[PDB]
Amino acid sequence: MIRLSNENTIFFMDKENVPIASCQSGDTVIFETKDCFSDQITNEEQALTSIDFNRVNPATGPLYVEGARRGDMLEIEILDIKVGKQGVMTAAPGLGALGESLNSPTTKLFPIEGDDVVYSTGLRLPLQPMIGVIGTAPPGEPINNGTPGPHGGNLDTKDIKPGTTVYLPVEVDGALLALGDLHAAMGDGEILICGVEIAGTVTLKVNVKKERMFPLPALKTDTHFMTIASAETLDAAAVQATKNMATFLANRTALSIEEAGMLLSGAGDLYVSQIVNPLKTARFSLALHYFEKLGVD
Amino acid sequence: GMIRLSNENTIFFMDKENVPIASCQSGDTVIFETKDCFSDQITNEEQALTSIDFNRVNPATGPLYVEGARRGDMLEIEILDIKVGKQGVMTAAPGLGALGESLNSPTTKLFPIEGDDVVYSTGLRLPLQPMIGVIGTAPPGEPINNGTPGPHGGNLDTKDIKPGTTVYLPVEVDGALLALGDLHAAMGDGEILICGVEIAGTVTLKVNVKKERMFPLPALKTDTHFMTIASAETLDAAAVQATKNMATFLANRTALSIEEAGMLLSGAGDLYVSQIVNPLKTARFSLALHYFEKLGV
Numbered sequence: 001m002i003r004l005s006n007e008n009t010i011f012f013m014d015k016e017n018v019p020i021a022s023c024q025s026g027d028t029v030i031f032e033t034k035d036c037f038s039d040q041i042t043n044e045e046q047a048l049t050s051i052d053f054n055r056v057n058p059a060t061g062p063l064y065v066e067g068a069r070r071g072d073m074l075e076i077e078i079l080d081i082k083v084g085k086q087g088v089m090t091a092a093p094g095l096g097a098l099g100e101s102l103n104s105p106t107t108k109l110f111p112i113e114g115d116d117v118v119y120s121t122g123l124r125l126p127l128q129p130m131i132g133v134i135g136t137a138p139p140g141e142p143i144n145n146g147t148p149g150p151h152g153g154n155l156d157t158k159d160i161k162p163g164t165t166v167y168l169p170v171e172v173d174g175a176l177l178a179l180g181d182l183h184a185a186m187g188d189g190e191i192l193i194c195g196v197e198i199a200g201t202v203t204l205k206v207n208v209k210k211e212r213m214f215p216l217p218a219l220k221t222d223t224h225f226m227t228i229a230s231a232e233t234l235d236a237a238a239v240q241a242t243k244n245m246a247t248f249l250a251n252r253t254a255l256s257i258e259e260a261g262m263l264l265s266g267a268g269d270l271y272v273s274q275i276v277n278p279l280k281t282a283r284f285s286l287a288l289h290y291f292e293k294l295g296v297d
Numbered sequence: 298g299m300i301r302l303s304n305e306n307t308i309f310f311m312d313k314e315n316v317p318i319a320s321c322q323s324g325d326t327v328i329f330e331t332k333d334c335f336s337d338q339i340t341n342e343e344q345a346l347t348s349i350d351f352n353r354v355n356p357a358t359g360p361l362y363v364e365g366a367r368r369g370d371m372l373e374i375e376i377l378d379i380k381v382g383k384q385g386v387m388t389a390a391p392g393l394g395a396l397g398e399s400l401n402s403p404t405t406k407l408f409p410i411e412g413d414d415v416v417y418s419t420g421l422r423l424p425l426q427p428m429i430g431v432i433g434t435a436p437p438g439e440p441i442n443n444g445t446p447g448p449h450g451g452n453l454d455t456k457d458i459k460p461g462t463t464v465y466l467p468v469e470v471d472g473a474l475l476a477l478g479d480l481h482a483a484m485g486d487g488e489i490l491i492c493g494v495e496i497a498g499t500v501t502l503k504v505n506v507k508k509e510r511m512f513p514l515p516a517l518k519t520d521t522h523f524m525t526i527a528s529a530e531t532l533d534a535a536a537v538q539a540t541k542n543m544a545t546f547l548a549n550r551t552a553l554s555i556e557e558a559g560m561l562l563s564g565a566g567d568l569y570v571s572q573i574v575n576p577l578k579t580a581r582f583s584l585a586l587h588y589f590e591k592l593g594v
């Protein structure tokens with residue numbers, strides 16, 4: 001019902017951004033988004049370097065969630081993501097995990113045809129819509145949308161998709177939730193620099209939780225719970241994400257930290273979100289089955 | 298069953314100078330009996346990790362001389378079956394693994410194997426998921442301790458190295474000199490504590506000699522995916538190496554250019570973590586085999 005337009009967009013997660021809309025806890029809110037190029041790239045002979053880089057990574061927002069105060073967390077249920085008709089990718093030498101291996105700058109447009117993302121005649125990828133950039137305002141200095149952090153931001157986590165609940169911190173009153181950078185498809189790592197970048201519309205439900213039960217950001221799918229951390233190195237983000245899960249498990253259950261460690265090492269999985277942003281992002285994942293067996297919800 | 302190697306014949310280093318305990322021809326079935334990665338030294342939960350003989354950790358059964366295998370070939374190794382013992386073991390040690398600085402006290406725990414389950418406690422059970430942790434050929438240069446992965450394989454701790462998986466390793470010295478060990482009853486991506494559920498057992502495999510080295514090694518193919526494996530000092534670099542191995546393979550061997558290959562990977566492939574606890578860290582890039590079928594590979 002409450003609908004946030006793609007003209008109402010920000011480039012930094014900033015506590016001083018004026019809210020574009022407000023909602024109550026439990027309200028459903030629709031966010032319309034531009035692609036991460038602010039829809040500047042519309043043909044395949046248009047180079048990445050041709051656009052205004054001041055307008056990359058627009059996030060729709062911020063939303064003021066009434067009842068949210070410093071120390072709370074948002075529980076955000078992703079009910080649906082609808083994408084547009086065509087996505088974009090850019091390959092640029094010197095960018096991304098293959099930067100030194102790429103030879104020429106390439107722009108590719110991807111028709112969305114049903115639930116297929118058309119790479120070429122013979123290659124069609126599954127339509128797997130996700131949110132790349134989702135976040136609340138940090139309490140101190142503004143952080144550009146292109147950088148991830150404890151507040152969220154540029155997480156590029158493929159599990160931030162329909163049916164997932166995302167958990168973010170409330171560090172300023174009202175939270176100031178903003179999102180953008182939808183993808184039609186993207187693998188773990190986002191190794192080129194980008195997913196199939198695309199505009200769309202996200203429907204979410206936003207709940208205010210008055211107790212912050214675990215380290216943030218975090219998310220829950222139909223089957224698994226995941227702690228997320230970002231750092232300068234993948235080495236450091238992986239360790240932090242893992243420690244986030246173990247200390248949570250230890251704190252909230254009859255398990256000792258050593259027992260929690262054994263559980264994670266035997267039954268949990270460390271995953272890579274993206275290795276290409278100014279901070280790298282990893283998530284540690286444990287089946288909800290185990291949390292229920294340890295009496296945790 | 299074809300050729301059988303007992304666990305009495307173990308090596309601690311992947312070394313071109315280790316004398317073969319056995320020979321086979323290309324296509325033979327080979328059975329490897331293994332000791333656990335403590336050489337079966339921990340049998341009781343009051344034994345400290347620091348009470349065992351460390352010059353006997355990471356035993357590999359082998360080396361096997363594969364006749365017809367020559368420098369420049371690769372081995373194609375089909376894991377037909379892995380049988381484990383009736384009890385596994387884990388060790389939590391302050392100063393070791395991802396949780397090193399969070400752990401309070403050294404802890405050893407025994408896991409009965411019961412049916413298709415790893416018994417963690419009265420309330421918690423893990424699925425029995427047998428895998429091989431240490432599999433490798435002899436490096437051409439100086440010997441490499443079994444605990445360290447490299448281009449030759451070694452301590453890869455990759456959970457996809459499991460029954461029904463085909464593993465590909467380099468032949469860098471004539472005969473290859475294949476050795477394997479370090480079986481687990483369960484383990485998650487990252488092996489974050491330092492160990493999986495460590496257990497002895499028996500591996501049945503078929504070993505084929507391939508005369509053309511078609512992709513960067515090590516590598517593997519499951520029933521649904523193909524993956525490139527790389528190890529490095531940092532997980533950052535292992536990730537970037539695994540990814541570049543996939544991308545340069547696809548570019549070199551298919552009609553795709555390197556830009557196009559990078560887009561396919563970023564959009565459709567996933568970067569995964571094998572382990573973060575060994576002297577080198579290991580990562581893998583995985584892409585669905587139906588994309589290779591499409592590309593005529």
Ligand SMILES: [Ca+2]
Nearest residue numbers: 132154156181
């Ligand atoms: Ca992004």
Ligand SMILES: [Ca+2]
Nearest residue numbers: 036132181195
């Ligand atoms: Ca994006």
Ligand SMILES: [Ca+2]
Nearest residue numbers: 250253254255
């Ligand atoms: Ca506890």
Ligand SMILES: [Ca+2]
Nearest residue numbers: 430452454479
């Ligand atoms: Ca190992």
Ligand SMILES: [Ca+2]
Nearest residue numbers: 334430479493
């Ligand atoms: Ca092991």
